């Protein structure tokens, strides 16, 4: 198990190290084969390297089999060249590995149903994984332009863009529940139709996987009325973006979430939260979006899914039994760190 | 007040002369000089014209100062051709009046939080009224097309479309609390850019209305979380149509909302929720939609603020005293109409 760590600025170092040491805590147990090397990324790089992703972290990135990303950015660099702004290091490493699908999962642990924006009976059991494509659609699309009269852009996507998506969202709801629900805008537009038909045939290969299709706007009702109904969810990038963060307030907790990007490359894992500077060696940052992230890479990166589960259930049972400050409790950072490797244990 | 009346199917003849008798219950009060005429339209007008939206109602409409429409469609004329289908006369009726703004409000009326998918405290206050664009955007897009390797539609806005728009938005912002949110994606495309530069230009006629914008990704969040927060909400044609769907869940009893049509030629008023043939003639259909896009007649049509107001809290306090059976009543049509009625005198 290769790991490139990548903890960036902010309170990555602090959360990153509270997820390595549940990594280390299973490598014990169960030998791994863990090997990890830390390397400068985003902000802490550019001071010590005058760039956010220097050489070294390209080639451990580009030698391991994992990224564990921190957090990156803070106002010292916001006022840099966007050639080398944290968040510009976060193109470069996703575009370094082509990455092209980016997973976040929203889910309401048992016991926290309280937090969620939602009542009870609708927030208990939501756990839906929402799978994006990253690499095309309107954001890249050409045409595009504006003048004094008018504005154009393109939702374009070719056959492989929507195969590959499709794909993932796949392989990724074989190692949770096997549904998986493609969402698109088929009934009035030819990329919907399109992609529709597309996923169809993709999920051919996938006969142990339950595909249905949904527009947009109506999965947009049902992420709020029964979301719980949901397991696997891929759409294209806009959209993607429009519905990983209405299901990423669910919850209710948005510190919680972690994320995965996907592709030809080094897959990388990270927390969904920034680098909240402001609280950076206090040991308070709540750690439960780091080590979900661990567990996304051991189920994502290596098939540990087993694995990804045991982590996931001891961050449910601390979350209960030592709430983080954000959950109204005390637990700092390493106190909550303990109580996820005592149930690991 | 001349008001053209098109019942249409189902329920439309009992819900929409619900709304009428509360017409005539204001205008004896108050000398509206209400004046109006009942025309064919949707399937009874397949049945007795053969076409869903004939002459003499097209006249009729084109006649009148606001259209009170009820419900159309059933599957008997779901097997016509889409040259008459009753659907497509709902087209026809927006396409003679250039109607280009659809006006979806969702309200949380005092003492109904407990049908909201969302908890008490977040639910408690929802009013809000989202205003899309109808007739441009990607739907109606060129280029668009598909072939075996790719598809593509474009989302193309000229300064008209979008100044047209947001115009009606601050002036329904005027009769309501003064706050405009623009809904964009103005941070990576060009149209969101565009539509955000129009809007604040527009914005500058309207001194006494607040104008702020949003990104569609943030907004979803938003109206999960705060949805109290806002007041009048604009955004193109998709956008429009994912975030009224997604605004439209949250007083969770989608029976209970209106619409409305807006435009160059006769405004329309008519109620979100379909024409539910299988209970026609029972005399348990709820008329608040239908009570309520009356509501919006006066409002919209004829700029009776303070009368609309008045039907809405009628209305809001027969919820409470007499509950329809979809809010686990047993306040039958007439019973309903009766104690709306009631506080209205």
Redesign the interface.
Known sequence: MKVAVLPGDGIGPEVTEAALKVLRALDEAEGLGLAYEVFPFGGAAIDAFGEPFPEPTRKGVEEAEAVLLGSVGGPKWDGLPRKIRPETGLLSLRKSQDLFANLRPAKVFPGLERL????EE?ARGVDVLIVRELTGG??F?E????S????????????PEVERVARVAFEAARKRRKHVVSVD?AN????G???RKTVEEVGRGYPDVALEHQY???M??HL??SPARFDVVVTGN?FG??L???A???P?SLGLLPSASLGRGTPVFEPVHGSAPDIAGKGIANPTAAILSAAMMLEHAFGLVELARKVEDAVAKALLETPPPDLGGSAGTEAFTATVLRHLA
């Open positions: 969620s924006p939602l009542k609708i309107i954001y699309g045409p595009r332009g504006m004094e009269a008018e504005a154009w852009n393109t939702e374009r996507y070719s056959k805008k009035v537009l030819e990329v139709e399109f992609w947009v706007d109506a947009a009702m709020v009325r806009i973006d429009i990983s963060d209405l990423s307030v669910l209710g």
